[PDB]
Amino acid sequence: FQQFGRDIADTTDAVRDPQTLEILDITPCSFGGVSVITPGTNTSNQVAVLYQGVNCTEVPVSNVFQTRAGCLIGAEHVNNSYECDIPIGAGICASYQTSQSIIAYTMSLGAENSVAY
Amino acid sequence: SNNSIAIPTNFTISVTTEILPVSMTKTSVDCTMYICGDSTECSNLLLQYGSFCTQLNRALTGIAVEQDKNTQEVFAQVKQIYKTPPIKDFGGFNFSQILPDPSKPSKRSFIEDLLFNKVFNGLTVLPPLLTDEMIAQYTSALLAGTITSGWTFGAGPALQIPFPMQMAYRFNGIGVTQNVLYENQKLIANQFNSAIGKIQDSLSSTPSALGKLQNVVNQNAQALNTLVKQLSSNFGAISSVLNDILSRLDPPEAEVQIDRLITGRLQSLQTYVTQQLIRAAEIRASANLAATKMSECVLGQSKRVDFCGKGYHLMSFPQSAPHGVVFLHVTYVPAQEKNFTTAPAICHDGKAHFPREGVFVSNGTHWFVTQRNFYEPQIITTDNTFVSGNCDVVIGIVNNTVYDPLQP
Amino acid sequence: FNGLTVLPPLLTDEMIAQYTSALLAGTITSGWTFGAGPALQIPFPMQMAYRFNGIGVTQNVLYENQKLIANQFNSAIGKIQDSLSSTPSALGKLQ
C-alpha cells in the first residue's frame, strides 16, 4: 500500500511508477563549484580547471583525471611525489613543472629518515 | 609539626589520556540554490537584496580554510619522516600498543584502530586536504623520533641515544638521581607496560570516553538537520512550496508570498552561518591548545604543573583520532611515604652546615642527608654540605657531627 | 517577569569557600606535593627555603633573615587588606 519514500530529513527519495509497479530512486541532478588553478600570470597564462564533487563523465564536453575532490581538466598526472605547491584536496596537489606544464600528484610529507639506533 | 617531614620510599609510573578536537567538517551551503533552486522569478527577486549571497559563501569558505590550517598546524610539526629500527630491544620497554602495526592494511596502531572503530537542497561537503593515512604517518614519525632521539629531534638535528639513558635524563629532570633508574629498570619497565595495557582496556571498555569528538559531530549534524527542516515552513505565506505559490496565484500575490518565503529562508541561513562562525572560533581555540601540547609535552619535557598530565611529567605520546588527537602522558607519582625528624642545619664545630642538594633526616637516633623525592639516606660529609656563619642565628639548628673524607 | 527566569548555580558559595580553604591548607602544610600525588608534610620555614632555592638564592639567606622576612610578609598582607578596603573600583571586572 506504500506509494513514495521519504528519508530522515523528510525529502522524497523514491516513487513507485503508477502503471508498472516498479520502485525507482530519485537522486539530485549534479551541482557543484568550479575552481581555476593558476601558477600566476607572472610566469604563465596556462591554467587548469577543477569541477568539485562531479564525475568526469557528467562534465559537459586536454587530459581528464578523476580525484576525490572532483574532475581535474588540463593537468597531467605524474607518478612521483613532491612538496605541496597548490592544494587541490584529498591528498592531491598541483604544481607547474617542466616542455612546461601543470602537473597533479599526491602529497609528499617529507624526506624519509632512519636514525641509527 | 615544625620538625616532622614525610619522604616517599617508592614510586609509580602512570599513564593518562587526554582527548582534544582539532577540526570539524567542511560544509558549504549555496545561497540561491537553498532559498529557491529551480525558480527564476524567485532568483530575480533575490537579486534585489544585494550581496547577501556572497557574504555567507565567503564566511563558509573562510571556515573551511581555517579547519585545514588547524590540522596542518597541529600535526605537521616534524620536518622529516623518522622510522623505528627493525630490532626493537628498548631495554624492556614495549611500545607495541602505540607503534604502527604493518599487518593491517591501514598501518594504524592498536589504540588508533580502537579509537577509529569506537567513533541536497544545495549543500555540499568538501574532503579534507590531509587524508587519515598522512595523519597516521605524522604521528608515527613523531613517535619514532621521540623513542629514538629524545627531545633533540625538535630543536635541530636528531641525535640517537639509548632509551634507558633517555629515561635516566628524564628522571634527572624532575629531581630524582640517575641511579634510581638503573637500579630499578625492570620494575619501571613492567609498570610502564602494565599502564599501557590498562589504557587500552579502559579505552575499549567504556564507550563514553570520547565525549568531545562525538559532541562536535552531533552539534554539526543537528545544525544541518535543523536548517533542512526549516526549509519547509510557511513564514506567514499560504504554503511552503513555491510551485503552489507560482501556479495558483496572479503575479502580485505570488510575488508577495515569494518575498515572505525569501525573507524567512534568508533569516534562517544567516542564523546558521553565525552559529557556525562561533563554533569555528571555539574549535580554533581547541586546536591552538592541542598544538601547544604537541610542542611542549611531546617534543620536550614540561615543568608546568598539571599541563602534561597529573604528576611529575616524564613524556607523552600522540595518537590520531577522527577530527582530533589523543595524548598519552607518562608521569611519575610518589608512594609509600614515611615520617622522619628533620632539622634546618647542623652545628659541627661552631659553624652551621647546610645541605648542598637534599635534606637532613633521622632514623630517630642518627642523622642522614637524603634527596627530597626519594629515600636514599647517606652519611653527612663535608662533600655534600656547605658552611655559612656560626650556630647562633639559625632557629632550630641541631648539634651533631659531620665527616671529612680527608682523614684516611 | 515576561517569561525570563534565573537558575541558581550548581555550587553554593559555601562549597567554593570550602575548596579555597582546602587549597590554602594544602599549600601551607604540604607545598608542591599535594598537587602531584600523596600530600607530604614539611615545616613552613623549610618550604620557604626550598622556594628561595628555586629562584637562585641560597637557603641560608632565609634562615639567617627569618624574622625580617616574616615581618615583611605580614606587613604586605595587612597592606593588601587596607588597599582592598580603600578603593571601591578595584573589583572592576566582576562589576
Add this chain to the structure above:
Amino acid sequence: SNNSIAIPTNFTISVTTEILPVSMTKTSVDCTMYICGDSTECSNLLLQYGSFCTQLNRALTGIAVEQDKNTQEVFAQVKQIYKTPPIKDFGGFNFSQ
C-alpha cells in the same frame, strides 16, 4: 661599561592581587511567553515560523551548562579536603588574614 656590574644587597617580599571572573548568571528566557504571554492567535501565528523558539532555548541552556563547567574546572582541583592544624605556629608567619 664593559667591566662593571650591579648586585643587590637586600630584598623585599611583595604581595600583589589579580582578579579574574569565571562565570556569569544563568538566565533562560522563554521564547513564546516573552513574545506574547496569553494571546492564543499569537501562538498559532508563531507556530508557522518553525523552530525559531527551540534554538534560542538550546543556546541559553548550553550557556548555563558552560557556566557550571567553568566554575567546576576552576575550583574543583583537590581530591581530598585538607584541614589546618589547631596549633598555628608557622615559624613567625601569620595567615589569619
Add this chain to the structure above:
Amino acid sequence: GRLQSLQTYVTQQLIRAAEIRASANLAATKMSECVLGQSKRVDFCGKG
C-alpha cells in the same frame, strides 16, 4: 520585531559567554601553575 530582538540578545550572550570561557580557562591555568606549584614564567604569577 520581538523575534528580531530575541535573536540579537541571544547572539550577544553567546559572544559574552565565549569571552567568559576564555577568562575561566586562564584562571584555571593560573590556579594549576601558581598555587599548586612554583612557576618560572615571567610576569605570569605577579611581578618579580
